[PDB]
């Protein structure tokens, strides 16, 4: 991962993630967990959310690379429902998004 | 609605709701919101969850009848994903479940 446009990323997040995730500090959980402070913890540790994916529950240390990989698969399992579009297949895309998430999640 | 078996209801909840909802006091949010104290508020007011369905967001006063109706439709929209099995089509079923939810949500 190499920094990109936080500005493009912000639009990515609003159009592809924000329907399931907030990022503001102390923001509420929705279908997915609030993501504030995501790059200072492991996976599966948002306060007041309880997780389903076995790998997220092993508590991976979130960094840029790990996250880029995580978001690479266009589909994602939404418990009890099925597969949803939760990924950016394009590299450039993730670099933009992750650049925004770093900032806005802090 | 007429009280039924909280015992049957408990099994219903564990097998059909618990994958998306907890009910214990102070229990965490998941795909759906924690439901503790559900019959003492309106819809769309769980602390630390942010909702999507326009009708839930109008804040309906949850009672037995309203809830039975709510759970009557076998399918339910899970934001960003699609339709999921979130209902009990059978009357007897809901009466069992709602009887348990009254107790366990308190
Ligand atoms: C590109 C857009 C998105 C990004 C970058 C993103 C990011 C993340 C991250 C980082 C996690 C792990 C959080 C943690 O470990 O605490 C997560 C989990 C989750 N996301 Fe997303 N997400 C996106 C889109 C979506 C969408 C559209 C949905 C729902 C339709 C969603 C639902 C979920 C759920 C349910 C979990 C928890 C999974 C589980 O418990 O098994 N995400 N997401
Ligand atoms: C019979 C089983 C279930 C019962 C009785 C039930 C009950 C409820 C109730 C009472 C609400 C409104 C909560 C409130 O107003 O605060 C709710 C909302 C919700 N439920 Fe369930 N539920 C069940 C199954 C499921 C399943 C299986 C899922 C996920 C696949 C789920 C996901 C949701 C979501 C996402 C919301 C919020 C909807 C929105 O924000 O638009 N439920 N449920």
Curated annotation (Swiss-Prot), chains A, B:
Methylation may enhance its transport into mitochondria. Methylation occurs in fungi, plants, and some protozoa, but not in animals. The precise role of methylation at Lys-76 is unknown, but it seems to preclude pro-apoptotic activity, possibly by lowering affinity for APAF1. Gene3D superfamilies: Cytochrome c-like domain (1.10.760.10). Induction: By oxygen at the level of transcription. Expression drops rapidly when the oxygen concentration falls below 0.5 uM O(2). One of its GO terms (biological process) is mitochondrial electron transport, ubiquinol to cytochrome c. Coiled coil: none annotated. The modification N6,N6,N6-trimethyllysine is found at residues 75-76. Heme c binds at residues 17, 20-21, 83. Binds 1 heme c group covalently per subunit. GO terms for molecular function: cardiolipin binding; electron transfer activity; heme binding; metal ion binding. Its cofactor is heme c. It comes from the Eukaryota. Keywords: Electron transport, Heme, Iron, Metal-binding, Methylation, Mitochondrion, Respiratory chain, Transport. It is found in: Mitochondrion intermembrane space. Belongs to the cytochrome c family. Present with 7330 molecules/cell in log phase SD medium. Electron carrier protein. The oxidized form of the cytochrome c heme group can accept an electron from the heme group of the cytochrome c1 subunit of ubiquinol-cytochrome c oxidoreductase. Cytochrome c then transfers this electron to the dinuclear copper A center (CU(A)) of the COX2 subunit of cytochrome oxidase, the final protein carrier in the mitochondrial electron-transport chain. Isoform 1 (CYC1) is the predominant cytochrome c during aerobic/normoxic growth. This is Cytochrome c isoform 1. It comes from Saccharomyces cerevisiae (strain ATCC 204508 / S288c).
């Amino acid at each position: 991962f190499k920094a990109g446009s936080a500005k493009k990323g912000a639009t990515l997040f609003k159009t592809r993630c924000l329907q399931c995730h907030t990022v503001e500090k102390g923001g509420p959980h929705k279908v997915g967990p609030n993501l504030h402070g995501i790059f200072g913890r492991h996976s599966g540790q948002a306060e007041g959310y309880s997780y389903t994916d076995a790998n997220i529950k092993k508590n991976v240390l979130w960094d840029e690379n790990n996250m880029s990989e995580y978001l690479t698969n266009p589909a994602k399992y939404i418990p009890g429902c099925g597969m949803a579009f939760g990924g950016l297949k394009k590299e450039k895309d993730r670099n933009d998004l992750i650049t925004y998430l770093k900032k806005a999640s802090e």
